[PDB]
Every structure is written in C-alpha cells, then in structure tokens.
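question for whoever is on the cluster today: can someone run the full assembly for these? two chains, 256 residues total. i dont have access anymore since they changed the login thing
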Amino acid sequence: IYATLSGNLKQLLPVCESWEDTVWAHFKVMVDSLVEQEIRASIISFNEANELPREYLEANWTLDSVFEELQATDKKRVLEENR
Amino acid sequence: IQRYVENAQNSASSPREKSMKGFLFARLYYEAKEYELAKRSVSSYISVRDPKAHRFLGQLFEIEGNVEKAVGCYKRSLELNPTQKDLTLRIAELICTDGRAEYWVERASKLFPGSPEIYRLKEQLLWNQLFDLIQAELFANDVYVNLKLVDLFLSNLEEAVLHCLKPERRALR
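^ ran it for u. tokens below:
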C-alpha cells in the first residue's frame, strides 16, 4: 500500500498481479513521477523535502513502454493475457 | 495588493528558482503600472511552461520591432511543449523578415485553410504549386482562391482564366 502510495513497485503481492492489475501499478508510477517533475519544474517543491531523491525513479516511461514491459512475461515469453 | 507582492517577494527569496512567484510578480506588475519591471520579472521566471510570461515578453519584443527576440521566445515556448499556442505565427513572421518561413506558413494553412494573411505571407515567401494549392482550396464558393490560383496559372493558365470568367459570371448573376 505504501509502495502504491509512493509510486513505486511492490514484490510478493505482484506475484499474484494479473494484466489489469500490473497495468494499474505501472501507470500509477508514471502519474506519480510526472506530477512530481511538473511540481519541481514549477519550483513548488522545497529543497528540505528532498530527503531521499536517490531512492526514487525520476524518469517516466511512455505509455508505449508501459505496455511493452507489461506485455513480456517474467520468463521471456509473450504474455498469454497480452496475446 | 501590497500584501500579495510581499508574500511573493518572500516566496522569491526563499524558493530561489520559484518561477510561479516571479511570473506572479509580473502579473502583479501588470495589475500595477510598471511594464519594464513586470517584463523583467517575466524574463527572470523564464530563466528559472507559462503562456502569460511567454506572451508578455513576446508582445513587448513584437512592438519593439525586434522580431528575432520574439521568434526566440515563441520558438522556445512552442518546442518546450509545456502549454501554449500563438507563437507559431510569430515564428513565421520572423522568418519572413524565406525558405524556412515557407514551412511555418504551410503548416499554419494545414491548421486553418481559410487563413487569408497566411495565404498572403505564403505567396510573398514564394506557379504550378500555387495552382495546385488553389485547386485544393477551391476543391474544398471562394472568389479569392479562384483569383490567386488563376493569377498563378497566368504567371506559369487557360483553365484559370476560364474559372475567373465563371466567377465573374456568378458575380453578375
């Protein structure tokens, strides 16, 4: 829950993550990173609040890469749900 | 009003990048009456997305006659793709002051084909191509299409002349 709130991934719970569920978690990372980057560009964030920048993914993937990464299985096969 | 510019100055001093303070300061200046300071504030904000910043500087340079600075602002405000629109025109008008311009006025027409002054600036940048454009425009009532394309054909035209005659007949009727 804290990982979903932070815009990060989780691990054991994603073992039982289906396509819709994995699409959601990965799009949530994209929204949470994009909002923070716009907030930084606008100068809204204060330097003091940057306790752990190095631990957070600043980069955002495109919607296309979201589907391509989700489309792969963990075992390097075409995802049966994506297919 | 004074209180709002004090809180802005505080939010300029402390969060030192703080474009939204500075742009806000520019807005306050506009509300106030010192367009030289407001413009400077806008420039500072730019140095540190904001369409009202981009247009206040670009309008100032435009009326200073400095179409190279106004292209600079408006080109950066387009290619940062962060939320603005008009700048496309001031790029074209700069380039006009030819081949490079040919690109921005052709794109403007593909966004609004009944854009007259844009068809005019396009001609000035530039016969067969013009006729084709007229056909594309005439193919989509419009007398000044029929007149420009016909003229282009003449420059290169019997069909254009016939079209002009037909237009004259329509006017008569």
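summary bc i know u wont read the tokens: Chain B touches chain A through eight residues (CB under 8 Å). The longest helix of chain B spans residues 158-172.
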